Amino acid sequence: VQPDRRWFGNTRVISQDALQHFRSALGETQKDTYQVLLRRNKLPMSLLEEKDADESPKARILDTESYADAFGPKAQRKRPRLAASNLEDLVKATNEDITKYEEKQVLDDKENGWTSAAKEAIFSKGQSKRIWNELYKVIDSSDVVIHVLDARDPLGTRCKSVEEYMKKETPHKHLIYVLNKCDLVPTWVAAAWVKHLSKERPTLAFHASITNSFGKGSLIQLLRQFSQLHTDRKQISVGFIGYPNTGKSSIINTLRKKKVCQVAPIPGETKVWQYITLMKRIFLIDCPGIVPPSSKDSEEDILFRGVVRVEHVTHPEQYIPGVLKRCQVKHLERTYE
C-alpha cells in the first residue's frame, strides 16, 4: 500500500446546515402504502437520531457505592436510602403493597403430583432451522418478498417478528401482502380485510387455481410494475413466504397457468424451494411454511391453522370441541348433515 494524502485524506465531510435540514425533514418521512423504497441515501443517521424525550434512564448508582459498601463484610451502607419522610406514609405504602400483592395472588395439577404429557414433536414444525434457513435464503435472494395470508384468518396467518427483520436488515425489500383463498370466505370479509391491511401493505386479492381464477392479471401487472421499477437490476426475483398450506405453490402455478409446483392439501408438500421463470424478467420462488414460535402459540390454535398434520396427533378427538368455537352451528348442520 503506497503512502498517499488519501487514507489520511478526508472523504465524507458535510456541512452542519445539511444536518439541520435533515433534522427538519425527519418529520416529513411519512409514506403512502403504495410508495416503495428503491435506495436509502447514506446519511449520518446517528446525528439525526436521539429524538426529544423525558425518560432519563436510571443513574449509574454503581459509581458512588458499587458492591462493597452496599453489602458484605465492610457493609458501609449504615442506613437505608431515601429516608422515608413519615411513618404514616410508610404505613400507607405498606397497605398499598399488601393490597397489590393480594391482587397479584388473586390472578391464580401439581397438587396431585401428575405432570403434563410431553408435547408431540409434530407441533414443533416448522422448527429445526431447516425451513428457517430456506426462508432466509429465499428472502435474501428475492428482490421483492411477498407474504400471503389466509383469507379465513389473515391476522392469525401473520409471520410476525420476520417482517420486522425484513424492515430492519433489508429496508429495500417491499414485502407486499397477498390475500389468497378469497373463495372460502364471504367477499365482504375479504373486502374488509384488504381495507384494513391497505394501511400498511397493498394486500392484493387472489384465488389460486390453474382453472379460472380471480386477480391473476392484477398480480401480473403488479409484478410487471415492480420489474419496471428495477430496470438497472437486470431482473427482479420474487419469493413467496407465509404459513404452511397457504397456497403459495398454488399461487405460483396460477401465475404460470400450469401445474409447475407440486401442490397438495398437506402442509408439507413444499419440501424445498425451486426456481421458476415467467417473462424472463422475473423469477418466482417459494419456501416451506414458516411458524414463528411463541409461548402464545396455543398448540390447538396451531392445529386449527393447519400447520400440523392431523394424522399424527395422539388425541384427535380432544380437538373436536374447538371446531364449534369458530364454525357456525348452521353450517356444520347443513354440511354433514
Binding site: 503506497q2 498517499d4 452542519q16
Partner: protein, 182 residues
C-alpha cells in the same frame, strides 16, 4: 405612498433574469417627444413596474447558512439572499454543443471484448529490490532508470531503449492524428 399596484392585465414575471414585462396599452400622448412631461410619465411607469417586481422578489424564499468564518464561497450567516427561480426567458446559445465525440477506434474494441477501464488508482508502484517507491509516471520513472544504470550487460543499449521509447511516443502521436482525421 402605498406600495400596492394593480393593472387590468397582470404583469408577466421572470424572477430569474430579474425582469418584468407589461402588456398594458401605452398612452401615445404621454410618450410623444414634444411633451416636456414625457419623461415623468415613463418614470412613474418604471417606478410602478419596479415596485411590482420588488413585491415579487421580496416574497422569494431566502437561503440561510450557519457557516461564517473560513467559508470559501458561502454566504455569511448575517447575509440573506433570494432563491431566484431559473429564468423562463429562453435565449440563444453562445456556441454549438461539443457533440463532435469520436470513439477513436479503441472504445469500440473495448466494448467488443472484456477489457475494462484502467483503475486510475495512482501512478506510484513499488520498485523491485529497493526500499522506496518509484513512480512509473509523473515523476522520476523506473522505465528511465535503465538508462541510468551503470551497466546493461549488452551501439549503446541505452540509445536503443530511448529509440524504442521515441518509437512508442511517435506511434501514439500517429494514432492520435489518425483519430483526428475522422
Amino acid at each position: 405612498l402605498p406600495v400596492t399596484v394593480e393593472k387590468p392585465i397582470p404583469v408577466v414575471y421572470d424572477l430569474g433574469n430579474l425582469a418584468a414585462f407589461d402588456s398594458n396599452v401605452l398612452d401615445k400622448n404621454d410618450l410623444d417627444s414634444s411633451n416636456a412631461r414625457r419623461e415623468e410619465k415613463i418614470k412613474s411607469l418604471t417606478r410602478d413596474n419596479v415596485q411590482l417586481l420588488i413585491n415579487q422578489l421580496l416574497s422569494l424564499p431566502m437561503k440561510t447558512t450557519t457557516e461564517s468564518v473560513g467559508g470559501t464561497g458561502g454566504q455569511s450567516s448575517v447575509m440573506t439572499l433570494l432563491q431566484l427561480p431559473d429564468p423562463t426567458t429562453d435565449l440563444p446559445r453562445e456556441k454549438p454543443l461539443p457533440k463532435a465525440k469520436a470513439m477513436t477506434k479503441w472504445e469500440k474494441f473495448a466494448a467488443k471484448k472484456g477489457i475494462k477501464p484502467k483503475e486510475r488508482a495512482g501512478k506510484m508502484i513499488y520498485d523491485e529490490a529497493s526500499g522506496e517507491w518509484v513512480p512509473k509516471w509523473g515523476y522520476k520513472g523506473a522505465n528511465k532508470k535503465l538508462d541510468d544504470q551503470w551497466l546493461v550487460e549488452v551501439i549503446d543499449p541505452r540509445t536503443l531503449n530511448r529509440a524504442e521509447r521515441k518509437r512508442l511516443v511517435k506511434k501514439n502521436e500517429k494514432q492520435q492524428r489518425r483519430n483526428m482525421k475522422n
